[PDB]
Symmetry: C2
Subunit: 150 residues, 2 copies
């Protein structure tokens, strides 16, 4: 386990033959209101475009997933709500340890990055038409909706 780089949000290490990127864990929030899902878009230099995502971010020191979810929702959309933990996933276990904890937000209230309210059916349609790209969080939100929120 030798380190080649220690950065701000990631470290690059070598474990034998494997190249490993250590990354802080993240959270993502699925929120539905009047049939529209709360998506967000922002310039992502890593990909050179703005994919359709849902409110998400890195867990700060001292924070547990639930608290980070509350914070990211408020900072990105100015909203607050009743949060329920759904599930988690490793974004790409073949090279990084980034783990994402997904929550559902209900009873949204305005308490205070482009906010994109859109019907999940439309988001999926646009993507199929090649008009927009998805981040893992955006796709998970869309599929979760079709599976359990209709």
């Amino acid at each position: 386990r030798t380190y080649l780089y220690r950065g701000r949000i990631l470290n690059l290490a070598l474990e034998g033959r494997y190249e490993i990127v250590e990354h802080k864990p993240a959270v993502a929030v699925i929120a539905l209101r009047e049939g529209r899902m709360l998506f967000v878009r922002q310039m992502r230099p890593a990909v050179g475009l703005a994919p359709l995502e849902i409110p998400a971010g890195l867990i700060e020191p001292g924070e547990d997933p639930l608290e980070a979810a509350r914070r990211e929702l408020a900072e990105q959309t100015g909203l607050s709500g009743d949060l329920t933990y759904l599930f988690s996933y490793f974004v790409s276990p073949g090279f990084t340890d980034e783990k994402t904890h997904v929550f559902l937000a209900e009873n949204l209230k305005e308490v205070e990055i482009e906010v994109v309210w859109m019907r999940p059916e439309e988001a999926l349609e646009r993507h199929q038409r090649g008009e927009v790209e998805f981040s893992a969080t955006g796709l998970v939100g869309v599929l979760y909706y079709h599976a359990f929120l209709r």
Copy 2:
């Protein structure tokens, strides 16, 4: 766009203030048979455990997504089938450009990593119980099933 490391499956670069990991694109295959989804597990040093995933891998030079999907399915499970492109997603656009193309496989045939046939409902239950972890591909497969394959 300065490079700090050029590796086998990834390059570490710096674009101004952003740390960027360039990664080859990938494919993932969702396959259902008799109510069971085709999951796979393998030791993943990046996370120190074996999460529940679906057949997936990197696209090789000269390959398009469909061909890579065919290959990964055959090499990991010894199966072949009729493949249909579903959608794609960026695993974590905040730092890497890894993009995953997801396909559906039908009419599986044996033509020739642990193969784990499991009902998606059971996979979800086990995860909720904290008995197993999910990779993004595994979760996407589970949600896709609940949304469109029941």
